[PDB]
Amino acid sequence: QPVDIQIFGRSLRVNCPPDQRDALNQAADDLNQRLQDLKERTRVTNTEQLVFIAALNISYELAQEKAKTRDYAASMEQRIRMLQQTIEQALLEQGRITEKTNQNFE
Amino acid sequence: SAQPVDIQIFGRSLRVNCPPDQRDALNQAADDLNQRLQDLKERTVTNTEQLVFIAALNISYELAQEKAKTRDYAASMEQRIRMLQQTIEQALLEQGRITEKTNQNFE
Amino acid sequence: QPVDIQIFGRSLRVNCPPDQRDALNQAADDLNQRLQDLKERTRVTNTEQLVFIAALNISYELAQEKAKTRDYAASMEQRIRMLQQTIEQALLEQGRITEKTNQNFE
Amino acid sequence: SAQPVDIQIFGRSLRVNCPPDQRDALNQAADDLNQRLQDLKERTVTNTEQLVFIAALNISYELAQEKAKTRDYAASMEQRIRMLQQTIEQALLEQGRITEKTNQNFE
Ligand SMILES: [Cl-]
Ligand SMILES: [Cl-]
C-alpha cells in the first residue's frame, strides 16, 4: 500500500505491504546512513550523484554477499562429504579387522 | 592505482574511481543496476533520481536478506557442530570405559 | 567353591564362585569341542597330547584376539581424530569466509 | 612349508607342525603357556595333564572375554555411527531448506 519514505532530505513514495513496513524502515535507515557516510569520505556533495554511486556500490555489495553465500554452502558441503567419508572408513576398517580369523598351529 | 572510469547509468554519465582489479565488478554492477532500473521503470513519474532511490532501497533490503541467509546457515551449523562434538566425547568416554576392562579367571 | 568338571572323558576339579559357574560350563563346552575338532583333523589320538596342543593353540588365539582388540581401538581412535579434524576445518573455513568484508568502489 | 618343531612345555616334549612365519608366535605361545602353568601350579595334586586342562579352561574363558570386548566396542560404535549419520542427514536437510530461500523486494 502507499508509503511515504524520507531519505537524505528527499521524499519517496514506495508501495509496500504492512508485513514489509519494518523492512522498509530499516532499508531507509540503511540507505540514509550509506549516503551520509559516502559523503564524508568522497567529498561529492550533489545528492543525485551520491545516490547513483551508493546504488552502484550496494549492487556490488549484493553480488559479493551472494558469492559469500555460495562459498559458505560449497565449503560446508565439502565438510559434510568428509564426515560421510569418515563413516565409510570406520565401516571398512571394522570389516577389515573383525573379519580376521584367529589362526592355529595345527 | 584507482583512476576515474566513465560509467553510464540510465541515461546518466558519472565518474567512478576504480582500480583495474575491480573494473570487471564495476562493469557488472553498472549492468545489474541498469537492468534493475529498467525493470523497475516498467513497473512504476519516473524522475530518474527517485527511481535510483527506490532501486537502492530494494537492493538494501535484498542485501539484508542475503546476509540473513549466511547468518541462518551459521546458526544451523552451530547446532550440527554441537551434536557432532558430543558424539565425539561420548566415543572417547566409551573407548576408555571398554579398554579399562580386565579379563578374569576361574582359579 | 569346589566344582567337578567333565572334559573329554576326564574329570577335573576347579574352584569357582557361583557367579562364574555359567562361564565355567561354557569354557568346558568350548574345550570339549576344541579337543574333538583338533582330533578329527590331526590324527593325534592321545588325550594328553591333544590337550597340550589345544592349550598351545588357544594361547596363540588369545594373543591374536588381544592384538585384534588393540587394532580395533587404534583404528577407531584415528577415525575420532578425523572427525575432530573435520570440525576445526568447518570452524576455520567459516572464519575465513565470514570475515571477508564486502568492498566498495569508493 | 610347515615342519615339526620340538616344543618343551612344563617338563614335556612334544612336536608341533608349524611353518616358519608362525614360529615366533609358537615360541611366544609356549612361553606364555609355560609361565601360565607355573603360576597356576603355585596356586593349586598337580598331575601335569590336569594342570594343562585347567590352564586351557582359563584361557578359553579369557578368550571369550576378550572377544566380548571387541563385540562391546562394535556395539558402542554402532550407536556412534547412527548419531553421526542423523547429524549428516539433518545438515543436508538444513542446507536445502536455507538455499531454497528467495529474496523479496518492496516494489
Ligand atoms: Cl529493484
Ligand atoms: Cl591360568
Curated annotation (Swiss-Prot), chains B, D:
UniProt main location, coarse: cytoplasm
Designated name of the protein: Cell division protein ZapA
GO cellular component: cell division site; cell septum; cytosol; plasma membrane
Function noted in UniProt: Activator of cell division through the inhibition of FtsZ GTPase activity, therefore promoting FtsZ assembly into bundles of protofilaments necessary for the formation of the division Z ring. It is recruited early at mid-cell but it is not essential for cell division.
PANTHER family noted in UniProt: CELL DIVISION PROTEIN ZAPA
InterPro entries: Cell_div_ZapA-like, Cell_div_ZapA-like_sf, Cell_div_ZapA_eubact, Cell_div_ZapA_N
NCBIfam families xrefs: PRK10972.1
Assembly description: Homodimer. Interacts with FtsZ.
UniProt family annotation: Belongs to the ZapA family. Type 1 subfamily.
The species this protein was found in: Escherichia coli
